[PDB]
């Protein structure tokens, strides 16, 4: 493959930069930050209680609307300074730009209201290394490399100014 795939991003106030991914069949679309300081994919779960402010205003993955969903359910946790982020492993198809990959990702069922309620995006695609991955889950760009369809094993960021 000689493919390069781009993804237009949104600049919110010079503080949040996020773009679009799709998860499932048919695709459920999420705003995500592409985070080279982390290695996992997380979105809100349709199982996250509406009594979490951080969940109550973002888009939630609903596994039971997805025909390519494959259940896992391993609990996994992130220690954020303001409180714990947690949910469970799921596998489904994710599209980033022109690229489709089967990917293990975490569905979040509880998180701190701060800072997450102020996020203008719904989730996160970690672009770091398997070493930094929680539960040593294969990161998305590792799975993109294994498809062997990219021109070069690199990814680049442009961030505009407001």
């Amino acid at each position: 493959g000689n493919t390069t795939s781009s993804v237009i991003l949104t600049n919110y106030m010079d503080t949040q930069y996020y773009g679009e991914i799709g998860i499932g069949t048919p695709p459920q679309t999420f705003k995500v930050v592409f985070d080279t300081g982390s290695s996992n994919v997380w979105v809100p779960s349709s199982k996250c209680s509406r009594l979490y402010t951080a969940c109550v205003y973002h888009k939630l993955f609903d596994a039971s609307d997805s025909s390519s969903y494959k259940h896992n359910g391993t609990e996994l946790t992130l220690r954020y300074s303001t409180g714990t982020v947690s949910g469970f492993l799921s596998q489904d198809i994710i599209t980033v730009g022109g690229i489709t990959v089967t990917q293990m990702f975490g569905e979040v069922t509880e998180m701190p209201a701060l800072p997450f309620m102020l996020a203008e995006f719904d989730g996160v695609v970690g672009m770091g290394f398997i070493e930094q991955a929680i539960g040593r889950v294969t990161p998305i760009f590792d799975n993109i490399i294994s498809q062997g369809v990219l021109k070069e094993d690199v990814f680049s960021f442009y961030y505009n100014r407001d």
Binding site: S5, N11, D14, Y17, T36, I99, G126, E152, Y158
Partner: protein, 171 residues
């Protein structure tokens, strides 16, 4: 108005200039490189004996240790608040250049690059795009070069070669 862009598989020349300069990662495992000094003006205030720099796209700001940023902030006349540092808005534009020594080069931000110039009034305080965050082992203590840095410097994360590459962003 385009807010930004990620390229999987390559880079976009339409959004940077000149050529990439690259820096080896210290170890595969983390998107972190060696830093050789942080300047304020033409003088090296900090990181004089080498220190680490995480290249963090999912961070809004440039961050150092609490101890480092207290010093950086001293030098800028900036005031400590619960969450941020501020200067009086009228001095934003005169604030000195801040430089990051990375690989062969100085990576220089001006005040336009790190002051939120929301006003020019001496009666009003402006935020700085630089914060204290203490990152614990393994990764930290480290600086982190977030969106404040990435806005100025178009960035390539290269897995084949375990390097990172910087080009001046074309806006």
């Amino acid at each position: 108005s385009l807010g930004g862009q990620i390229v999987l598989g390559g880079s976009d020349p339409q959004h940077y200039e000149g050529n990439f300069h690259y820096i080896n990662l210290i170890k595969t495992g983390v998107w972190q490189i060696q830093m050789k000094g942080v300047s304020v003006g033409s003088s090296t205030l900090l990181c004089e004996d080498g220190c680490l720099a995480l290249v963090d796209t999912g961070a809004s700001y440039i961050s150092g240790s609490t101890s480092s940023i207290e010093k950086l902030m001293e030098a800028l006349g900036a005031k400590k608040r619960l969450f941020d540092y501020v200067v009086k808005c009228n001095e934003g534009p005169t604030l000195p250049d801040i430089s990051f020594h990375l690989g062969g080069k100085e990576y220089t931000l001006t005040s336009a690059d790190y002051v939120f110039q929301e006003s020019y009034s001496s009666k009003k305080l402006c935020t700085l795009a630089i914060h204290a965050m203490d990152i614990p082992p393994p990764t930290g203590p480290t600086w982190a070069l977030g969106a404040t840095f990435i806005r100025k410097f178009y960035t390539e994360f290269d897995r084949r070669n375990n390097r990172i590459g910087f080009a001046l962003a074309r806006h």
